[model samples]
Target: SMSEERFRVDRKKLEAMLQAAAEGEDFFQKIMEETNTQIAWPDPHIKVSGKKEDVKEAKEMIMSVLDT
Candidate 1:
C-alpha cells in the first residue's frame, strides 16, 4: 500500500460536517460508498459519587436515575 496523504481542516467546520455525515443518511451513504468506510459510536457510561448533610442544614442532593 502507498503512503496516505495528510491534510488540515478547520475544526469547527469539520465538526459540522461530521454531524451532517453522521445524522443524514444521504451524506453517510455517499461518503461511505466512495470511501468504503464505516463508523462505530462509542459505548456510553455513567459514574456517580457524592454526599449530603441533615442538621436542618440541607446536604448535597443526589437523585438516582435508578437502581436495580
Candidate 2:
C-alpha cells in the first residue's frame, strides 16, 4: 500500500490534513483544537525549472505522488 511507503510522521499528518480539509477546517483544527496548536506543511517542494507552466505541472505531479 502507498501508506506503507510513507514515513510515520508524514502518514499521520496526511491523514489529519485530508480529514480536516474535507471538513473545511485547518489541517490541525479538530486534531489540535483542544491544545490550540497548528501544524506546518510537511514537505514543501521547490521545482526550479525554466518554464512557469513546467513548474506548475511539476507541482501537480508532486501532489499526485503524495496522494497515492
Best by TM-score: 1
lDDT of 1 at 18: 63
Between which residue pairs do clashes occur in model 2?
A: none
Model 2, stretches more than 4 Å misplaced?
Answer: 1-46
TM-score of each: 0.36, 0.29
lDDT string, candidate 1, 19-51, tens digits: 776776654344334444332221122222112
In model 2, the number of clashes is 0
Residue 28 local lDDT, model 1? 35
Question: What tens digits encode model 2's per-residue C-alpha lDDT throughout 1-68?
Answer: 01111121335545665776787855334333433322244333222232444434433443453453
lDDT of 1: 0.30
